[PDB]
């Protein structure tokens, strides 16, 4: 199997387009990335109109020869790390599924499904979504998995649409210690109230930043807005090494000091925060209180 987004349920073109690793390696957010992708397809020999078809109806000959085509074409452009070995589950005549696709569907179904009062309502909706995802586990239900797959596709589209705008507007401010980015305004901001959706967006941004020529490993701070509450949901993210690296420079994973910094600043200043999430690196802060807090985080020992 390959590091591809729903390969067996979407077209091969959409899979290559929305795959995060290929996005990072080929800079698909501008037009040169699309030109290089069309170069990829032309050199492999798959017709564009053929590659824009569903995997079920896509041609049997190239389905059989896909492995050899990849092995012979992907060496030039540095994508040879996409090939891996995965687990495939088949039960009856319903079809075949893979672990990566299953976990993507589960995560999407967790994300989307169905002051203090509205916070409680949001947490209750999250609990209900958890129950729905739990119920979807059994093999007797597949309308609760097709919906998850389509929701995963929609959420990945939305994340890509927001990330390209962030990258082109260059909102990533580079400080001396850590990078900072704040989503002040935009479309569909109401989706990012979910911590897992925010983490997905941050993971894509981290991959995009790591797949660059910069030689600085700095933590990234991401914030959002929910106008009904007038609060900033801030998440701290650790840097990541490129997936194509040896194990010698992997003595220990990068540690996360954001929770410690947050708790120290909260214990020394009277900020109107609410640190209650199980993930200690995700906090809720006030719009008026963010900026001084940030300054403190800048001036404190990390």
């Amino acid at each position: 199997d390959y590091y591809l987004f729903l390969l067996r349920h979407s077209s091969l073109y959409d899979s290559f387009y929305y795959s995060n690793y290929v996005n990072a390696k080929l800079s698909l957010w501008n037009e040169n990335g699309k030109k290089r992708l069309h170069k990829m397809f032309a050199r492999m020999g798959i017709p564009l109109s053929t590659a824009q078809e569903t995997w079920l109806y896509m041609d049997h000959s190239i389905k059989r020869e896909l492995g050899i085509i990849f092995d012979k074409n992907l060496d030039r452009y540095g994508l040879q790390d996409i090939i891996r070995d995965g687990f495939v589950r088949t039960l009856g005549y319903r079809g075949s599924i893979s672990a990566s696709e299953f976990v993507e569907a589960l995560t999407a179904l967790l994300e989307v499904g169905n002051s203090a009062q509205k916070l409680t309502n949001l947490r209750k909706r999250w609990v209900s979504n958890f129950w729905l995802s739990w119920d979807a586990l059994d093999d007797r239900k597949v309308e609760l998995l097709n919906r998850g797959i389509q929701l995963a596709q929609d959420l990945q589209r939305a994340i890509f649409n927001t990330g390209v705008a962030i990258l082109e507007k260059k909102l990533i401010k580079h400080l001396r210690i850590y990078r900072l980015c704040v989503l002040q305004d935009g479309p569909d901001l109401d989706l990012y109230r979910n911590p897992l959706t925010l983490l997905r967006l941050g993971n894509w941004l981290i991959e995009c930043c790591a797949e660059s020529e910069d030689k600085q490993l700095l933590p990234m701070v991401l914030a959002s807005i929910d106008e009904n509450t007038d609060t900033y949901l801030v998440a701290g993210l650790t840097p990541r090494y490129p997936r194509g690296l040896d194990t010698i420079h992997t003595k220990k994973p990068i540690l996360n000091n954001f929770s410690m910094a947050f708790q120290q600043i909260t214990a020394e200043t009277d900020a109107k925060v609410r640190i209650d999430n199980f993930e200690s690196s995700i906090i809720e802060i006030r719009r008026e209180d963010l900026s001084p807090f940030l300054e403190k985080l800048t001036l404190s020992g990390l």
């Binding site: 037009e31 069309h38 170069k39 032309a42 050199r43 020999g45 017709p47 705008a165 305004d185």
Partner: protein, 662 residues
């Protein structure tokens, strides 16, 4: 075998056709052709055909364009062979092109098995009247007007037969799109008998034939046009459209016919033209800036230059100043025309709401103000341009019309003027003198962007994405500054409201403005005088020197820039001042009819937004900044202010100075 180019100078056979196909010379031709399209360098020192091959691979198209003058300047003997005997040369050229394409893209044959090569522009040009017997079986270049198009049908390419008298399967045979395959003795058995096609193992092409007339601008006055038949093979289908003047490079051929001999009493032969390349020549008659089938297409380096020049400061000012470099003053008109021809983004909300994304411009003013010259320049500029005028256009002429086909004898639909203006501009002159019945038929065109016909049992709706630019003159021939706009023109509110930008040009008396204008006019007149390495490039650099003194950027580069900006970049509108624009709209709702006569509606709000989107498009940027909104609001408020009575213009000018503060 002495496979040398100098050995091709002298012929040994009786003619070219039988000599080209000789095995010894064919391989020499192939190797020389390969060396040509693999080694030819451009003025910059790069293999242009390599970039052509890469672009062909990216677009997975079927045609590779080879410039004729490139082949003529180097290895001219091959050019002569191709010009005199095209059939025996194009096949070798196709084979070598396929090999060259496979060189860059191995296993490319899976996408397509064969490639068709195209000739850009032959040196000699003929008309339909100047056709003789000497120029047969050779390339011809004919301009004309497409009148009747047959359609799309498939044809056999590799024909095989199964003869059941002996169980003999004939090998694959060709077809020349105008002759039936006829075999006499049927292979080894050497006899004639029953046979069938057995078309389960065959390959198909598609063809389209069309009737070509003479251009009305080329025919001598008061005479009749000459008709010919044009045959289009694969990849040429539906490229040409009815009513669109075209220029076709093709091969002249003749064949036998029965009733032509029957009615004439002499062995006369019918003639048809097998097309090889098509170039559109509708509107834009200026055909000297650059060469190629399509002048609105760009290479990769031209795209890189576009991106490089799209990031400098004040590029909008340079673009505005580079439009009509021989017309003095009228900065507002230039800005309005640029914003109109760059256009906006059509909006679709949930598939159930539609918002128009094009800008209309109305020009009104005194005579001798170069409105017609600006309209002509716009026609020369846009990719699609249609020119109408005064009483010379009818209501059903601009709109699609209903006609009965004389052959099949039933009602059909004929494309109107506006349909040709789809994705383009429709230019109207003398807008005031056009009759009201011929004026009230474009409301859907300006607003709904759709044309609906319910005539003679035919119910269909036609799309029309056209931007209308109009010019007119006020009542009495001059503009009365001390009168409202309602008493200046005879138009009504429904037609006036649909124009996003309305400009008024006043001819006044000034001592130094007249002197400056006269100096500019005299300098222009003395500049365009016909009397002031290769001579062609010397003339081209003379043209560049002439043009650089009034144009900040070359015109053809601007042409491709316009095309690229209209093609790819789509602005996005997120961070705009809700309160500022809302209060500006509220203020324009104030005054207006409550104090004067100019009508203002919600359409002007969308007009401001479209102008802001256009200004974003100017910079090749995907997102609207604040400066674009400021410029759009400044333009709109200026256009609104300068159309009031001189009594209150100063008061409104000082009143509305708080929103366009800058």
């Amino acid at each position: 075998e002495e496979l040398t180019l100098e050995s091709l100078s002298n012929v040994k056979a009786n003619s070219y056709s039988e000599w080209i196909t000789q095995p010894n010379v064919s391989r020499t031709i192939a190797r020389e052709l390969k060396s040509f399209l693999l080694e030819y360098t451009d003025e910059t020192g790069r293999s242009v055909y390599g970039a052509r091959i890469r672009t062909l691979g990216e677009m997975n198209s079927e045609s590779l364009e080879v410039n004729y003058r490139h082949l003529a300047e180097s290895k001219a003997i091959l050019a002569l062979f191709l010009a005199k005997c095209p059939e025996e040369m194009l096949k070798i050229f196709d084979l070598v092109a396929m090999e060259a394409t496979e060189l860059h893209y191995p296993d490319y044959a899976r996408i397509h098995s064969e490639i068709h090569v195209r000739i850009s522009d032959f040196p000699t040009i003929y008309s339909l009247r100047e056709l003789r017997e000497s120029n047969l079986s050779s390339l011809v270049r004919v301009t004309g007007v497409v009148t009747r198009r047959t359609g799309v049908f498939p044809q056999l390419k590799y024909v095989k037969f199964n003869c059941l008298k002996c169980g003999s399967i004939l090998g694959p045979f060709f077809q020349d799109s105008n002759e039936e395959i006829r075999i006499s003795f049927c292979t080894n058995c050497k006899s004639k008998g029953p046979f069938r096609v057995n078309g389960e193992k065959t390959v198909y092409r598609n063809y389209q034939r069309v009737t070509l007339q003479e251009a009305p601008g080329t025919v001598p006055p008061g005479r009749l046009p000459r008709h010919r038949e044009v045959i289009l093979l694969a990849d040429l289908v539906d490229v040409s459209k009815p009513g669109e003047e075209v220029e076709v490079t093709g091969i002249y051929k003749n064949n036998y016919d029965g009733n032509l001999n029957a009615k004439n009493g002499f062995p006369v032969f019918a003639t048809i033209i097998e097309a090889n390349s098509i170039k559109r020549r509708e509107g834009n008659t200026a055909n000297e800036g650059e060469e190629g089938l399509d002048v609105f297409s760009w290479t990769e380096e031209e795209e890189r230059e576009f991106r490089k020049i799209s990031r400098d400061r004040g590029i909008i000012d340079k673009i505005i100043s580079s439009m009509a470099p021989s017309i003095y003053g009228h900065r507002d008109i230039k800005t309005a025309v640029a914003c109109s021809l760059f256009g906006g983004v059509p909006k679709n909300v949930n598939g159930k709401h539609s918002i128009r994304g094009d800008i209309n411009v109305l020009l009104l003013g005194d005579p001798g103000t170069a409105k017609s010259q600006i309209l002509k320049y716009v026609e020369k500029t846009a990719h699609r341009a249609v020119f109408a005028t005064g009483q010379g256009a009818s209501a059903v002429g601009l709109t699609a019309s209903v006609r009965k086909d004389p052959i099949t004898k039933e009602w059909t639909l004929e494309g109107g003027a506006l349909v040709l203006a789809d994705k383009g501009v429709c230019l109207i002159d003398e807008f005031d003198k056009m009759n009201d019945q011929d004026r009230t038929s474009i409301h859907e065109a300006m607003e709904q962007q759709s044309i609906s016909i319910s005539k003679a049992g035919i119910v269909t709706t036609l799309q029309a994405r056209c931007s209308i630019i109009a010019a007119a003159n006020p009542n009495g021939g001059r503009y009365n500054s001390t009168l409202p706009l309602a008493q200046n023109v005879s138009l009504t509110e429904p037609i006036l409201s649909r124009f996003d930008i309305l400009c008024v040009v006043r001819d006044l008396v000034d001592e130094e403005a007249d002197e400056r204008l006269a100096t500019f006019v005299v300098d222009s007149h003395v500049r365009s005088h016909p009397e002031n390495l290769n001579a062609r490039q010397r003339r081209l650099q003379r043209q560049r020197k002439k043009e650089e003194e009034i144009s900040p950027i070359p015109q053809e580069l601007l042409m491709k820039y316009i095309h690229y900006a209209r093609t790819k970049i789509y602005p996005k509108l997120h961070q705009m001042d809700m309160d500022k624009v809302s209060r500006v709209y509220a203020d324009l709702r104030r005054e207006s009819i409550s104090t004067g006569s100019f009508p203002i509606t919600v359409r002007h709000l969308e007009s401001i937004l479209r102008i802001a989107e256009s200004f974003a498009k100017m910079r090749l940027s995907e997102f609207v900044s604040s400066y674009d909104l400021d410029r759009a609001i400044k333009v709109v408020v200026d256009s609104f202010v300068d159309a009031q009575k001189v009594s209150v213009r100063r008061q409104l000018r000082r009143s509305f100075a708080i929103y366009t503060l800058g």
